[PDB]
Amino acid sequence: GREFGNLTRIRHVISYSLSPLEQRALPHVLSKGVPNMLRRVRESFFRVVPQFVVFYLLYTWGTEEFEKSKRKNPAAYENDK
Amino acid sequence: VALHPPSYPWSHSGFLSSLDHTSIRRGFQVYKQVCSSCHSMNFVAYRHLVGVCYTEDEAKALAAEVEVQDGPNENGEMFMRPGKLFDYFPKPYPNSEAARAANNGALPPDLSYIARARHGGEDYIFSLLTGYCEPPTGVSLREGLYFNPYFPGQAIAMAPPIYTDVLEFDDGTPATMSQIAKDVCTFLRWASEPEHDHRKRMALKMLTMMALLIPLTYIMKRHKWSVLKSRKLAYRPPK
Amino acid sequence: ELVDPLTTVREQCEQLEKCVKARERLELCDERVSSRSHTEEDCMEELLDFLYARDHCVAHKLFNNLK
Amino acid sequence: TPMRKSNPIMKMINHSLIDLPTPSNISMWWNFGSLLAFCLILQIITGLFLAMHYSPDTSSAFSSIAHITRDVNHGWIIRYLHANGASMFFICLFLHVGRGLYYGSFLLLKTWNTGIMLLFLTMATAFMGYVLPWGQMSFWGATVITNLLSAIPYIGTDLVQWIWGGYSIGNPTLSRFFTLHFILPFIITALTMVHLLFLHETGSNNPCGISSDSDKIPFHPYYTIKDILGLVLLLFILTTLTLLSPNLLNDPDNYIPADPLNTPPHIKPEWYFLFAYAILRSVPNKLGGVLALFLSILILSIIPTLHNSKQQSMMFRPLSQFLFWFLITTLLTLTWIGSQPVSQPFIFIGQLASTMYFTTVLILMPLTSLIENNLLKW
Amino acid sequence: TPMRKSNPIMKMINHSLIDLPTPSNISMWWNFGSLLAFCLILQIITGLFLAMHY
Amino acid sequence: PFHPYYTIKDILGLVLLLFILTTLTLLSPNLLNDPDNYIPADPLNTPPHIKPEW
Amino acid sequence: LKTWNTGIMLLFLTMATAFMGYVLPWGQMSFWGATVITNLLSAIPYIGTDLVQW
Amino acid sequence: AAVAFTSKLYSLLFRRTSTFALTIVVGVLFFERAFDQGADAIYDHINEGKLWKHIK
Amino acid sequence: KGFSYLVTAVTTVGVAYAAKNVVTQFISSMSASADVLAMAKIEINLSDIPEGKNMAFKWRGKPLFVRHRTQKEIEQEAAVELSQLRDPQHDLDRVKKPEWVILIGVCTHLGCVPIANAGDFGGYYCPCHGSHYDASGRIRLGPAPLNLEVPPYEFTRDDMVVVG
Amino acid sequence: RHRDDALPFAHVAIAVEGPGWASPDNVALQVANAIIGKLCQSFQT
Ligand SMILES: CCCCCCCCCCCCCCCCCC(=O)OC[C@H](COP(=O)([O-])OCC(O)COP(=O)([O-])OC[C@@H](COC(=O)CCCCCCCCCCCCCCCCC)OC(=O)CCCCCCCCCCCCCCCCC)OC(=O)CCCCCCCCCCCCCCCCC
Ligand SMILES: CCCCCCCC/C=C/CCCCCCCC(=O)OC[C@H](COP(=O)(O)OCCN)OC(=O)CCCCCCC/C=C/CCCCCCCC
Ligand SMILES: CCCCCCCC/C=C/CCCCCCCC(=O)OC[C@H](COP(=O)(O)OCCN)OC(=O)CCCCCCC/C=C/CCCCCCCC
Ligand SMILES: CCCCCCCC/C=C/CCCCCCCC(=O)OC[C@H](COP(=O)(O)OCCN)OC(=O)CCCCCCC/C=C/CCCCCCCC
Ligand SMILES: CCCCCCCC/C=C\CCCCCCCC(=O)OC[C@H](COP(=O)(O)OCCN)OC(=O)CCCCCCC/C=C/CCCCCCCC
Ligand code: HEC
Ligand code: HEM
Ligand code: HEM
Ligand code: HEM
Ligand code: HEM
Ligand SMILES: O=C1C(=C2CCC(c3ccc(Cl)cc3)CC2)C(O)=C(O)c2ccccc21
Ligand SMILES: O=C1C(=C2CCC(c3ccc(Cl)cc3)CC2)C(O)=C(O)c2ccccc21
Ligand SMILES: O=C1C(O)=C([C@H]2CC[C@H](c3ccc(Cl)cc3)CC2)C(=O)c2ccccc21
Ligand SMILES: O=C1C(O)=C([C@H]2CC[C@H](c3ccc(Cl)cc3)CC2)C(=O)c2ccccc21
Ligand code: FES
Ligand SMILES: [Zn+2]
């Protein structure tokens, strides 16, 4: 079936490659890779983060409320006698 | 609801810190002379003390102190004999109904995993042992209960089990309640998890190895993928 | 005769401000509950608050005196 | 020809993982299937060893595990490995599902359906292993899960009593749990092979959602070394969890043996289940609760049917992405609610989280897809 | 095509035991393989049941 | 082709095997049975006459 | 050849299985059968006894 | 020209696959012992006074 | 090329170390546990064993024979020619007192228990594959390669013996 | 690599580096060549 002899039909594309032993494995990290990671974080920040911030607010609120609910109310004894 | 135990600075809590075996040796005396009246420790035997705080001969000596049932003999009858290394610490009661009958309806639990079966571990137990006090105003206790804020409910059947000079340690340490509690707690830690020290020993090695193998294999990957990472294309139609 | 370090350490911690305010609240609640004729209130919550506050600083300073 | 292609067994291996054409551009999210397989293998091995020391009897189960962890040489670490491997297995499983939801790989219908089958099987297996120690939590977990069939209106109670083998949970039920837990993993293995057979007829989707037949590379050497790297990382994490912090995920209430007369005040299943538990807790009706419980997972089967977009992947669809991450947070919320007592704040929050989960899958995503289409003018 | 030949799982079944070419003249001695398989299946089923009581 | 010829032939073989198996199970169950395996194990004594399964 | 060799493998496997089922009742014959079959590896000259005990 | 270390290493050991394999077994033999000894030393040193080997 | 291959070498060395450790500890899971390895001694009262009687006792999981030999047995066991044996040994190499002999009742061929006072030689006969022993425990016919094993013992009374 | 799927047949060339005119080794290499030079239409060393 699917085999490297007849996958698709292409015309007029040229490629060039070096061998691994001719070139470096980690050529430019701090001059190219770091800024690229930075933009890659920039492009997705506001699509992911705010939902989790909202989750954090909800969690803390619900915890606080549950913990208030367990403390004794002075009006339950002071009001009528 | 129950009061949250504070964190005490236990010397074995570091990532690669071992247990203090002196404290184990003293805690075990506490568990002989006091705590093995009510409580069972069904999953520990004398052979387990060998190489931890005792030689084989001295552990046999401990064993020898106790009578144990055995048989049948050649006549078909049971008998009593002195203990051996392969015998389990003896039970205080024959059955749980008898245990309840001797403690006004309450059943003392088995302390073989008490430190792993409670929230807070040895912080809780210490807190429980040192923590008895007189009740607040408005509170009352039914027949045969004590007050203790670190118990869920604050009413507990167990009377305060330890006090100063309730025993004497063979190494001359002064037997204040606090010292006794800390030591028995160390001993319960050891009873719940014998593999502790060897586990940390073994972590150092194989973690060093697995940490080493990451950058090496990453380098191999980068080597194989450089062919594609630097590839250059062009489009040249006759136009 | 032996003096248990825990006694002294408690007595020392109980001098601190965060303990003192809770201790005062405890006294106030004792006074109410003792003064009434017939009530269902009890003074336990206040006691537990005070004990939480105090045992926090006992735990930072007890084990230095033990072996 | 080379021997690589001389013979059916060898040629199937070759078409599977030597000369298979893979996309050049797939990312780390595609490593989690191989890690799943690794985890299955690990579980089977460690299980076959444990099996030779465990006792499927209610009067010795607990103590057989005590024996394993105290007297068997390095038995403690074998126990630790089994228990932590299950957790890793589910971590990988969840991430594996989520990928496919994000990148639109559910359009491979056969692979997707066999995946749903596998999810169900793995969950059954994990639960039937969780009750074998016969601790205090294990017992009541068994009880609840076997009472679930009482909700079937006409025949339910009889089904419950026919699964128990008696008037109640007891010795005859534990051996059933153990036989089933023994046999299921191998059915899982066979179905995994079918799963991959179905996959290799089309090949892998990729992050861009467009056809990659102009830039296929062979599986060997590229993805061989890549997956080996992934495995090394998984082993580092697993070792640190096994040796440096074994008690992180552990539950104390299962170190107390079973007591048929007392349920403990605070109930909590294993973490990978909490969310279902929350869902089950949220409906004030028995039958409705169970129905929701099962629909929560069965709903994946109609996602392919509700797909309106012209594009396959969310890579180029921002509104879609926003909704995706909101759904993930709803699931986190259900997990958190599952841990808490059944008290009023958490009751109300859980009900909202459940309604929003189904709402989002069934309504909001389809409609956002239509809006998106209109914004691109088709 | 018929569905018999539309699909890998189905086409493997078909090549196995529907459209497989067999000799016309083989005798009773060739029945014992299928009986072996039957026996294996019987053993597995009865064993899974026994297992739950042993 | 395998179907229908050898399908029905093997079904016939299976019917025969089931007849034999039932007669062995219900009409004469003790034919191949060994009495010495109805005595539980005794690590101190090997019986005088030893015989494995046929 | 391939079918024949896989057949030999299957024969061996089936025999192992049958024998390991025969010792499960723990009767008087089962016990001594176990004993003999597990002492068989003592015949390996350098490592045998240790294999038996393992 | 420049007889350099890695080139000698390639030409003597790594060029032939059998010898590469032999090099690997020989290296692991010695790595194992050195690595064990170092680890045990560190471990023993972190918690002197608390192990029963010495208390004995 | 050298440098790139050195990296691979080093990686392989580490992987081999880890693999060895994992596999070996798994294998050591299946050896005897720390509750199976008890080794006690056993004391036998000899005044309950008539002359000509072979008694069997359970010891360390296996039979232990104690045999109280008669005079003609003591006589005729000494006559044996040691050249016609596959495991040559004299009777007085195998007993401490002539009228008592103590053996481990396990057949040296494949482990069955010999029946006493049976076979061609007045000693013991093993039904499983047909090996004969004499009243010294010496192998005389059949497939077994060695004589019956003698444990360490000593006499604490003229009517008490301890085997350990 | 220059890809054009409309051409009838694929052409391929693969070399390593040779020593040059001056070296002696050339002779031996030629012999090797003659030893090497079915699947395809046309082939040469
Ligand atoms: C209380 C318990 C009750 C139990 C009840 C059991 C009832 C069982 C009923 C079974 C009914 C089966 C019906 C099957 C129909 C299938 C039709 C078909 O297509 O068949 C094709 C098949 C043949 O296939 P094929 O394609 O020709 O290929 C075969 C060859 O390749 C062909 O090669 P060839 O052509 O060269 O061969 C020619 C010739 C080759 O001939 C020879 O080789 C020569 C033979 C010479 C023999 C001479 C006599 C004996 C020797 C004497 C020698 C002299 C001694 C001198 C001594 C001197 C001493 C001093 O071979 C034959 O012709 C053989 C035909 C006869 C087959 C018999 C089958 C017996 C089955 C027994 C089953 C037992 C188990 C039952 C369950 C028990 C449960 C407890 O069979 C037939 O054609 C015959 C069908 C009819 C068979 C009937 C069998 C009845 C058995 C009844 C037994 C009752 C007693 C049980 C006792 C139990 C004790 C524990
Ligand atoms: C006594 C102590 C132990 C001694 C152990 C010694 C062995 C050490 C390990 C050696 C590993 C094997 C290395 C050599 C493998 C050679 C394989 C070979 O020649 O076959 C290659 C060739 C490749 O096929 P094509 O692609 O068609 O080739 C066309 C080329 N244009 O053939 C094949 O297909 C592969 C055949 C593989 C055969 C492998 C044989 C393995 C033998 C192992 C013996 C182990 C003995 C252990 C004894 C232990 C003590 C009792
Ligand atoms: C032991 C306790 C375990 C608790 C549970 C653990 C599992 C759940 C973990 C939840 C958090 C996961 C965070 C993962 C990292 C997210 C990083 C991120 O936002 O990156 C966005 C970045 C954007 O890239 P692109 O759109 O492709 O374009 C870039 C190329 N130009 O990547 C992505 O969006 C890829 C998203 C892939 C899917 C991720 C799925 C994560 C959650 C899956 C499990 C959730 C539960 C199960 C869900 C399904 C239930 C039916
Ligand atoms: C409520 C009580 C229970 C009621 C049960 C009712 C059902 C009773 C049993 C009915 C069995 C099925 C009979 C009809 C099958 C029709 C199959 C069909 O149409 O497909 C044939 C056609 C053949 O393929 P080609 O060769 O390509 O055809 C080309 C022709 N030139 O299609 C196929 O490939 C086969 C498709 C099979 C579909 C089978 C559907 C089965 C549905 C079963 C429903 C059971 C419901 C049970 C409910 C129980 C109570 C909750
Ligand atoms: C157990 C916990 C271990 C934890 C440490 C990490 C484990 C994972 C480490 C990676 C394991 C990789 C296993 C799979 C093999 C990967 C091979 C690889 O990447 O190299 C490719 C390369 C293929 O060569 P090519 O250059 O592509 O073709 C040349 C044609 N002229 O692979 C080879 O070298 C193939 C030849 C065999 C190599 C050896 C295979 C492994 C077995 C060797 C040791 C044998 C004894 C094993 C005993 C095990 C215990 C009983
Ligand atoms: C008889 C006088 C006892 C002695 C001596 C000791 N304990 Fe005990 N213990 C006893 C009873 C009757 C109970 C039941 C309490 C109840 O409310 O049911 C207990 C309980 C414990 C517990 C359980 C704590 C929990 O939260 O469940 C622990 C951890 C415990 N006891 C520890 C302990 C120790 C260390 C002792 C020796 C210093 C000891 N106990 C002695 C009765 C008796
Ligand atoms: C034991 C459980 C499972 C195993 C072992 C397993 C294994 C695999 C493997 C090895 C792959 C190869 C590609 C990859 O790794 O991404 C894969 C792909 C895939 N899996 Fe599974 N899987 C399992 C469960 C699931 C589940 C639960 C689902 C969906 C609910 C699923 C759906 C898919 C899909 C759709 C693909 C192909 C998607 C693509 O290539 O883009 N699988 N699986
Ligand atoms: C997908 C594969 C598997 C999964 C997810 C799985 C999961 C689990 C889990 C979660 C437990 C309980 C862990 C604990 O109590 O700490 C368990 C226990 C057990 N499993 Fe597995 N298992 C798998 C495969 C197997 C297999 C193939 C066997 C074969 C016998 C097996 C045998 C056992 C045994 C004997 C136990 C009880 C021992 C114990 O609790 O430690 N398991 N399993
Ligand atoms: C569980 C054990 C086995 C099973 C389930 C099995 C199954 C089968 C089946 C269904 C066939 C189809 C043709 C026929 O029935 O004759 C077959 C053929 C065959 N079997 Fe097996 N078999 C088993 C063991 C063996 C053994 C032990 C051998 C040889 C020592 C063997 C060698 C063969 C050969 C050579 C054929 C083809 C011969 C021919 O077609 O002329 N098999 N087997
Ligand atoms: C080729 C497949 C099988 C063969 C040949 C086989 C054979 C046997 C035999 C000969 C016995 C002893 C019969 C007796 O003592 O009367 C036995 C017992 C047993 N087998 Fe099977 N068996 C097979 C498959 C299985 C499977 C898959 C299981 C799954 C659990 C199983 C479970 C058992 C059990 C529990 C026993 C003991 C019960 C008893 O002795 O009645 N067997 N087997
Ligand atoms: O990891 C695989 C993979 C497979 C590799 C081999 C694995 C494997 C697992 C266990 C064993 Cl014993 C052997 C191989 C199974 C997964 C497979 O079939 C794909 O199609 C695929 C596509 C893209 C990215 C990764 C993969
Ligand atoms: O019986 C078979 C056979 C096969 C039929 C289907 C059987 C079978 C067994 C179990 C199930 Cl669940 C399904 C099918 C297996 C044997 C098979 O493959 C052959 O090639 C063959 C050739 C000649 C004569 C008979 C046969
Ligand atoms: O009350 C419960 C409970 O409700 C469950 C539930 C959790 C969800 C499970 C579940 C069932 C089906 C699926 Cl597809 C997924 C999860 C079923 C058991 C438990 O697991 C449990 C464990 C221990 C004590 C009590 C309990
Ligand atoms: O003495 C034996 C004995 O020798 C075997 C033997 C029979 C042949 C077996 C065998 C081993 C290997 C193969 Cl490939 C085939 C059969 C091994 C056990 C028994 O089965 C046996 C059963 C019960 C009591 C005693 C005995
Ligand atoms: S076991 Fe005694 S002769 Fe074989
Ligand atoms: Zn270790």
DSSP code string of H3-45: --HHHHHIIIIITSHHHHHHHHHHHHHHHHHHHHHHHHHHHHH
Residue D81 DSSP code: H
* Nearest by CB: B136 against C5, C44, C66: C44
Distance of alpha carbon F38 from alpha carbon F41, whole angstroms? 9
Q: What is the dihedral of CA B107, B110, B115, B117, to 10 degrees?
A: -70
A29 part of contact set with chain B, CB < 8 Å = no
Residue D246 DSSP code: T
Query: CB D271: neighbour CB atoms within 10 A?
Result: 14
Partnered with residue I62 across adjacent β-strands are: I59
Residues listed for chain G: 54
Give the largest CA-CA distance in chain E.
Answer: 52
What are the structure tokens assigned to A45, written together?
Answer: 């920040």
Partnered with residue I161 across adjacent β-strands are: I44, I155
Contact B41, B191 (CB under 8 A): yes
Instruction: Mark yes or no for CB contact I13/H20 under 8 Å.
Output: no
> For residue B105, which amino acid is it?
G
What are the structure tokens assigned to A58, written together?
Answer: 């909800």
Chain E and chain J touch, per 3+ beta carbon pairs within 8 A = no
**Strand I139-141 with I153-157, pairing:** unpaired
Judge whether E47 is annotated as a binding position.
no
User: How many angstroms separate the first and last alpha carbons of chain I?
Assistant: 66
Contact D63, I14 (CB under 8 A): no
Give the closest ligand to the alpha carbon of residue E2: 4
Distance of alpha carbon D258 from alpha carbon D265, whole angstroms? 14
Contact G30, F41 (CB under 8 A): yes
Q: What is the dihedral of CA H38, H40, H44, H45, to 10 degrees?
A: 10
Contact D318, D299 (CB under 8 A): no
Give the largest CA-CA distance in chain F.
Answer: 62
Give the largest CA-CA distance in chain H.
Answer: 62
G18 part of contact set with chain I, CB < 8 Å = no
Contact D268, D250 (CB under 8 A): no
Question: In terms of Cα–Cα distance, which of F48, F14, F50, F46 is closest to F34?
Answer: F50
Chain F residue closest in CA terms to G30: F37
Displacement of CA B232 from its chain's centroid (Å): 64
> In chain B, what residues touch A16 (CB-CB under 8 Å)?
231-234
**Residue I131: CB partners within 8 Å, gap ≥ 6?**
I107, I108, I109, I114, I125, I139, I141, I142, I143, I144
3-state SS class at D32: helix
Partnered with residue B233 across adjacent β-strands are: A15
Q: Say which residue the tokens 């291959």 belong to.
A: I5
Atom from ligand 9 closest to the CA of residue E26: 41
- Radius of gyration, CA atoms only, chain I: 25
**Residue D80: CB partners within 8 Å, gap ≥ 6?**
D242, D243, D246
3-state SS class at J4: strand
- Tell me, letter by letter, the H, E, C secondary structure of chain B: CCCCCCCCCCCCCCCCCCCCHHHHHHHHHHHHHHHCCCCCCCCCEHHHHECCCECHHHHHHHHHCCEEEECCCCCCCCEEEECCCCCECCCCCCCHHHHHHCCCCCCCCCCCCCCCCCCCCHHHHHHHHHCCCCCCCCCCCCCCCEECCCCCCCEECCCCCCCCCCCCCCCCCCCCHHHHHHHHHHHHHHHHCCCHHHHHHHHHHHHHHHHHHHHHHHHHHHHHHHHHHCCEEEECCCC
What are the structure tokens assigned to I34, written together?
Answer: 């720390």
Contact C49, C20 (CB under 8 A): no
Distance of alpha carbon I66 from alpha carbon I44, whole angstroms? 9
Question: In terms of Cα–Cα distance, which of I60, I72, I68, I70 is closest to I106?
Answer: I60
3-state SS class at E48: helix
Q: Measured between alpha carbons, how far is residue B89 from residues B58, B83, I78 in Å?
A: 16, 10, 53
Q: Measured between alpha carbons, how far is residue B129 from residues B11, B41, B109, B125, I13 in Å?
A: 19, 18, 15, 6, 53
What are the structure tokens assigned to B22, written together?
Answer: 């002196």
Judge whether I131 is annotated as a binding position.
yes
Distance of alpha carbon B111 from alpha carbon D147, whole angstroms? 33
Q: Say which residue the tokens 């088995």 belong to.
A: B110
> For residue F28, which amino acid is it?
S
Q: What angle do CA I33, I35, I40 make, to 5 degrees?
A: 120
**Strand B79-82 with B146-147, pairing:** unpaired
DSSP code string of C2-28: ---HHHHHHHHHTTSHHHHHHHHHHHH
Distance of alpha carbon E16 from alpha carbon E9, whole angstroms? 11
Question: In terms of Cα–Cα distance, which of B42, B52, B88, B46 is closest to B69?
Answer: B88
Asked whether D105 lines ligand 7 (CB < 6 A), one says yes
Distance of alpha carbon B21 from alpha carbon B61, whole angstroms? 20
3-state SS class at D21: strand
Ligand 15: centre distance to CA I142 (Å): 8
> In chain F, what residues touch E17 (CB-CB under 8 Å)?
2-3, 7
Contact D264, D253 (CB under 8 A): yes
H or E stretch including J28?
helix J26-36
Distance of alpha carbon B162 from alpha carbon B159, whole angstroms? 9
User: How many angstroms separate the first and last alpha carbons of chain E?
Assistant: 52
Distance of alpha carbon H33 from alpha carbon H26, whole angstroms? 12
- Burial (Cβ within 10 Å: 0-12, 13-18, ≥19) of residue I66: buried
- Radius of gyration, CA atoms only, chain D: 23
**Residue B174: CB partners within 8 Å, gap ≥ 6?**
C2
D270 catalytic? Reply is yes
I132 catalytic? Reply is no
What are the structure tokens assigned to D128, written together?
Answer: 């039937």
Distance of alpha carbon H53 from alpha carbon B18, whole angstroms? 13
User: How many angstroms separate the first and last alpha carbons of chain A?
Assistant: 89
Question: In terms of Cα–Cα distance, which of D145, D95, D93, D371 is closest to D269?
Answer: D145
Contact B18, H47 (CB under 8 A): yes
The phi-psi region of residue C42 (left if phi > 0; otherwise alpha if psi is between -120 and 50; otherwise beta) is beta
What are the structure tokens assigned to D95, written together?
Answer: 């991430």
Q: Measured between alpha carbons, how far is residue E26 from residues B56, E18, F4, F10 in Å?
A: 75, 17, 15, 12
> For residue B94, which amino acid is it?
P
Contact F46, I112 (CB under 8 A): yes
Q: Say which residue the tokens 């004794």 belong to.
A: A72
Displacement of CA I5 from its chain's centroid (Å): 55
**Residue J43: CB partners within 8 Å, gap ≥ 6?**
J37
Contact H21, H14 (CB under 8 A): no
Partnered with residue B88 across adjacent β-strands are: B45
Residue D341 DSSP code: -
Backbone phi, psi, residue C47, to 5°: -60, -45
Contact C4, B167 (CB under 8 A): no
Distance of alpha carbon D267 from alpha carbon D278, whole angstroms? 12
Judge whether D195 is annotated as a binding position.
yes
Ligand 14: centre distance to CA F52 (Å): 6
Displacement of CA J14 from its chain's centroid (Å): 6
3-state SS class at I66: strand
3-state SS class at D257: strand
Distance of alpha carbon B69 from alpha carbon B78, whole angstroms? 7
DSSP code string of A33-65: IHHHHHHHHHTTHHHHHHHHHHHHHHHHHHHHH
- Tell me, letter by letter, the H, E, C secondary structure of I90-148: CHHHCCCCCCEEEEECCCCCCCCCCEECCCCCEEEEECCCCEEEECCCCEEECCCCCCC
User: What is the experimental method?
Assistant: cryo-EM
D15 catalytic? Reply is no
Contact C29, C43 (CB under 8 A): yes
Contact D151, D290 (CB under 8 A): yes
Distance of alpha carbon D100 from alpha carbon I150, whole angstroms? 72
Q: Measured between alpha carbons, how far is residue A18 from residues A21, B224, D21, I3, I109 in Å?
A: 8, 12, 22, 18, 69
H or E stretch including D373?
helix D365-375
Contact D322, D296 (CB under 8 A): no
Distance of alpha carbon B164 from alpha carbon B170, whole angstroms? 15
Instruction: Mark yes or no for CB contact B227/A16 under 8 Å.
Output: no
Backbone phi, psi, residue A33, to 5°: -65, -45
Residues listed for chain A: 81
Residue I63 DSSP code: E
Residue D343 DSSP code: -
Q: What angle do CA C51, C55, C57 make, to 5 degrees?
A: 130
Distance of alpha carbon B91 from alpha carbon B79, whole angstroms? 17
Distance of alpha carbon I89 from alpha carbon C10, whole angstroms? 82
Q: Which candidate in D64, D204, D309, D313 is catalytic?
A: D204
Q: Testing the interface with I: which of G30, G32, G49 to mutate, by most I Cβ within 10 A?
A: G32
**Residue H36: CB partners within 8 Å, gap ≥ 6?**
B205
Q: What angle do CA I41, I47, I53 make, to 5 degrees?
A: 90
Contact I92, I100 (CB under 8 A): no
Residue D211 DSSP code: -
What are the structure tokens assigned to B157, written together?
Answer: 């059947």
D226 catalytic? Reply is yes
> In chain F, what residues touch E34 (CB-CB under 8 Å)?
10, 13-14
Distance of alpha carbon E16 from alpha carbon E10, whole angstroms? 10
Q: Say which residue the tokens 């005040």 belong to.
A: D265
Asked whether D209 lines ligand 7 (CB < 6 A), one says no
Query: CB E33: neighbour CB atoms within 10 A?
Result: 11
B217 part of contact set with chain I, CB < 8 Å = yes
Contact C41, C33 (CB under 8 A): yes
Distance of alpha carbon I85 from alpha carbon D189, whole angstroms? 59
Q: How many CA atoms lie within 13 A of B46 on its CB side?
A: 21
What are the structure tokens assigned to D203, written together?
Answer: 């090949």
Preceding omega of B72 cis (within 30 degrees of 0): yes
Contact D127, D145 (CB under 8 A): yes
User: How many angstroms separate the first and last alpha carbons of chain B?
Assistant: 83
Query: CB I153: neighbour CB atoms within 10 A?
Result: 18
Distance of alpha carbon D283 from alpha carbon I54, whole angstroms? 77
> In chain I, what residues touch F48 (CB-CB under 8 Å)?
115, 127
Q: What angle do CA B61, B66, B68 make, to 5 degrees?
A: 125
Residue D60 DSSP code: T
Distance of alpha carbon D333 from alpha carbon A61, whole angstroms? 13
What are the structure tokens assigned to D165, written together?
Answer: 């083998």
Question: In terms of Cα–Cα distance, which of D44, D80, D86 is closest to D272?
Answer: D86
Instruction: State the smallest CA–CA distance between residue G10 and chain I in angstroms.
Output: 27
Contact D338, D278 (CB under 8 A): yes
Buried b / exposed e along H12-50 (16+ C-beta atoms within 10 A): ebbeeeeeeeebbeeebeeeeeeeeeebeeebeebbeeb
Residues listed for chain E: 54
Contact B156, B148 (CB under 8 A): yes
Chain A residue closest in CA terms to B223: A25
Q: How many CA atoms lie within 13 A of I48 on its CB side?
A: 9
Q: Measured between alpha carbons, how far is residue D53 from residues C58, D57, I29 in Å?
A: 46, 12, 10
Q: Measured between alpha carbons, how far is residue B187 from residues B23, B42, B120, B195 in Å?
A: 7, 15, 16, 14
Ligand 11: centre distance to CA D38 (Å): 10
Q: After which residues, if any, is chain C broken (C to N > 2.5 Å)?
A: none
DSSP code string of chain G: -HHHHHHHHHHHHHHHHHHHHHTTT-BHHHHHHHHHHHHGGGGSTTTHHHHHH-
**Strand I160-163 with I153-157, pairing:** antiparallel
